[PDB]
Design a protein around this ligand. Structure first.
Ligand SMILES: *C(=O)[C@@H](NC(=O)[C@H](N)c1ccc(O)cc1)[C@@H]1N[C@@H](C(=O)O)C(C)(C)S1
Length: 265
């Protein structure tokens, strides 16, 4: 029994786990704590890139953005290396998705513009996709730090799955922009030990991870069966019982995904 297996994993990792897989074709939706709020952490960077792509002509990707020492305020594997030269919008999108670069995401928020350094426009983009649940209130590093239960900077496995479905599988973006977002998530470097780890090699996986304080570990993915049948998989977790410094536990996500993959096979 699936709910029993997820609850077993919660006890194993002293965690709260949320899972959603939308209904499609002949599979019922898979849901576990799917309507409970979890911190976005870096998972927001996927719809952020979509927002930026949607808002501008495709060749806005070629615009050079400059930034300085005081803009590096969070884990930023790429932006720290290019600080002397700047990064184009396309480079920033690439880094935000593939390396979960915090500075890149902060600069992309500013590019979107408006109140809250872009967080309000980001939230408005989600509302345009019918997501009345999610909210972004802060940028990096603050967005990963809200106390357990606080609704700031949260989504739900249900809400973010439906957003990702529209972005990758549906028609939220035109095909060319859709393909850019899909390819960056396909080439993600941070996700090998999460949803990817729970699906057989002959299934295609694209994803965006998130990791935060209070043992937060998330992953949102689109997977394709060996016959090209796609599914959206959202797994979110925290370990609030260990306090602020609780270790995120990727293995929880790998195990949850293995259970999901068993049902979808
Ligand atoms: C978004 O989730 C980002 N999270 C980190 O910036 C955050 N400071 C943090 C990282 C790791 C911890 O143990 C605690 C807080 C980036 N996205 C993450 C991811 O998995 O995608 C990282 C790649 C770790 S950093």
């Amino acid at each position: 029994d699936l709910a029993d297996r997820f609850a077993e994993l919660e006890r194993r990792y002293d965690a709260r786990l949320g899972v959603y897989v939308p209904a499609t074709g002949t599979t019922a939706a898979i849901e576990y704590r799917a309507d409970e709020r979890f911190a976005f952490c870096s998972t927001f960077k996927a719809p952020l890139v979509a927002a930026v792509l949607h808002q501008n002509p495709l060749t806005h990707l070629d615009k050079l953005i400059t930034y300085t020492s005081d803009d590096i305020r969070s884990i930023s594997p790429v932006a720290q290396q290019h600080v002397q030269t700047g990064m184009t919008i396309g480079q920033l999108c690439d880094a935000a998705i593939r390396y979960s670069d915090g500075t890149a995401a902060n600069l992309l928020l500013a590019d979107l513009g408006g109140p809250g350094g872009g967080t309000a426009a980001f939230t408005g983009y989600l509302r345009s996709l019918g997501d009345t649940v999610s909210r972004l209130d802060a940028e990096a590093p603050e967005l990963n730090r809200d106390p357990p239960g606080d609704e700031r900077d949260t989504t739900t496995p249900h809400a973010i799955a439906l957003v990702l479905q529209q972005l990758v599988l549906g028609n939220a973006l035109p095909p060319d922009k859709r393909a850019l977002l899909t390819d960056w998530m396909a080439r993600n470097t941070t996700g090998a030990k999460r949803i990817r780890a729970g699906f057989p090699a002959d299934w295609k996986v694209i994803d965006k991870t998130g990791t935060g304080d209070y043992g937060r570990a998330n992953d949102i993915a689109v997977v394709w069966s060996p016959t090209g049948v796609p599914y959206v998989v959202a797994v979110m977790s925290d370990r609030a019982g260990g306090g602020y410094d609780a270790e995120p536990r990727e293995a929880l996500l790998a195990e949850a995904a293995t259970c999901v993959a068993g049902v979808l096979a």
